[PDB]
Amino acid sequence: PCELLPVGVGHPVQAMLKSFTALSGCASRGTTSHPQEVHIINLRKTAEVALHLRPIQSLHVHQKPLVFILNSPQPILWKVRTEKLAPGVKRIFHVVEGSEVHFVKVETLPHGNEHLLNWAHHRYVTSFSELRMAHDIYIKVGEDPVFSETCKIDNKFLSLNYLASYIEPQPSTGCVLSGPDHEQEVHIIELQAPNSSSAFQVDVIVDLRPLDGDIPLHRDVVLLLKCEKSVNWVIKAHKVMGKLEIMTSDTVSLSEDTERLMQVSKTVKQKLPAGSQALIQWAEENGFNPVTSYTNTPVANHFNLRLRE
Numbered sequence: 001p002c003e004l005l006p007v008g009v010g011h012p013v014q015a016m017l018k019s020f021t022a023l024s025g026c027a028s029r030g031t032t033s034h035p036q037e038v039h040i041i042n043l044r045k046t047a048e049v050a051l052h053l054r055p056i057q058s059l060h061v062h063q064k065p066l067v068f069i070l071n072s073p074q075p076i077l078w079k080v081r082t083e084k085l086a087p088g089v090k091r092i093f094h095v096v097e098g099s100e101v102h103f104v105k106v107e108t109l110p111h112g113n114e115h116l117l118n119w120a121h122h123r124y125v126t127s128f129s130e131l132r133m134a135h136d137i138y139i140k141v142g143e144d145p146v147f148s149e150t151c152k153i154d155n156k157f158l159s160l161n162y163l164a165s166y167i168e169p170q171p172s173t174g175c176v177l178s179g180p181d182h183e184q185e186v187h188i189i190e191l192q193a194p195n196s197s198s199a200f201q202v203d204v205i206v207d208l209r210p211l212d213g214d215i216p217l218h219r220d221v222v223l224l225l226k227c228e229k230s231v232n233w234v235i236k237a238h239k240v241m242g243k244l245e246i247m248t249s250d251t252v253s254l255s256e257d258t259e260r261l262m263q264v265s266k267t268v269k270q271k272l273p274a275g276s277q278a279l280i281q282w283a284e285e286n287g288f289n290p291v292t293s294y295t296n297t298p299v300a301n302h303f304n305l306r307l308r309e
Contacts, residue, residue, distance in 0.1 A: 002175040002276050002294055012211075012293050012307070013189060015170040015300035017196070020163060023130040024113060026151040027159050031126040032143050036065040036090070039139055039162070042116050042130040043072040046098075049134050053082035056142035056161060065090040066141060069120055071109045075099045113153050125151040127162050134164040167302075174295040175276070180308060183242070186222040186288040187295070187305060188279050194231050194301045203253070204231045204301050209238040211306035218242055219307055221262075222288045224279060225250065226272050237261050240307060247272065247286070 007013075023044065031037050043049070051070075055062035061084045070078060075098030082103060093104045110116050113130050120128075126143065128151055140161035194202045204227070210217045216239040225233050225248040232251045235244070237258040244262040246252050252267045273282055276294050283291050297303075 004173045007172045007174045013295040014304040015172050015297040016302040017168045018302050021132045021166050024155040025129040025157045026153050027127045027147045028151040029147045030149040036067050037126045038067045038124050040069040040128040045073045048077035050136040051080045052138045056140045059142045062141045067092045069094045129162045131164045133166050135166050137164040170300045172295045172297045176293045178290040184220040185292040187293050188224040190296045191227040192298045203234045205234040206303050207236045208305045
């Protein structure tokens with residue numbers, strides 16, 4: 001009954017790959033004696049990027065003038081979203097030809113990290129973040145006394161103060177076999193890898209909610225989760241009430257909300273077969289009938305499961 005095809009937008013399971021995008025960076029305590037803070041972004045490929053501004057957990061309300069060297073190879077639309085910024089303080093953004101800012105000086109900047117650092121040294125450094133790509137960049141403004149007085153680029157450097165994320169839709173293979181039948185849905189997610197690296201025992205989020213979004217559902221859910229690598233399945237339910245049964249050999253983390261909304265059956269580890277045919281067969285033999293859908297994804301760490309009605 002399963003005829004696998006590359007899945008469309010209407011397939012109930014939509015895969016994504018959310019990643020942290022840091023390549024190299026540094027941070028410094030050195031900007032203390034100077035008048036403005038200098039935060040450098042070196043982006044590595046019109047596209048828009050969200051720049052989220054907030055102070056370090058130490059600071060209540062950030063008062064120090066800021067300068068942002070925002071390097072990109074091709075132009076980008078920078079939409080700055082700030083929290084706890086003193087209005088009226090000098091806001092300077094050094095940007096490339098064609099780039100624009102929201103909520104400013106146009107420059108010719110070098111592409112290398114040390115050259116871009118050298119460009120900043122010549123004019124004025126608190127932080128440098130080289131990023132692979134980015135939808136959103138999160139920067140915590142303030143001098144952290146944990147860093148050295150110098151900013152020395154390191155490809156193994158990561159601070160929670162300077163982060164950037166990217167969400168990439170991922171193609172899947174799959175089939176929808178039946179509709180919700182006995183106020184229940186049974187979904188099989190066969191994942192090949194959680195990421196594009198050797199990052200072991202990572203979280204794979206299963207976001208479970210109605211396709212509508214405003215009207216909460218009374219629906220029982222069975223999930224058969226399979227991966228050929230070790231993963232931690234994170235179940236995040238929203239606006240769905242009913243039984244939740246997870247059939248997997250991996251570890252399962254339930255959201256605080258999954259527990260208040262759903263009656264989660266005790267996760268008893270199960271060894272499942274591989275491939276669409278074997279997995280559909282296993283489900284029916286174990287009393288999870290009829291199967292709503294099957295999805296095969298080569299690489300993903302986030303699945304959006306949407307329930308009909």
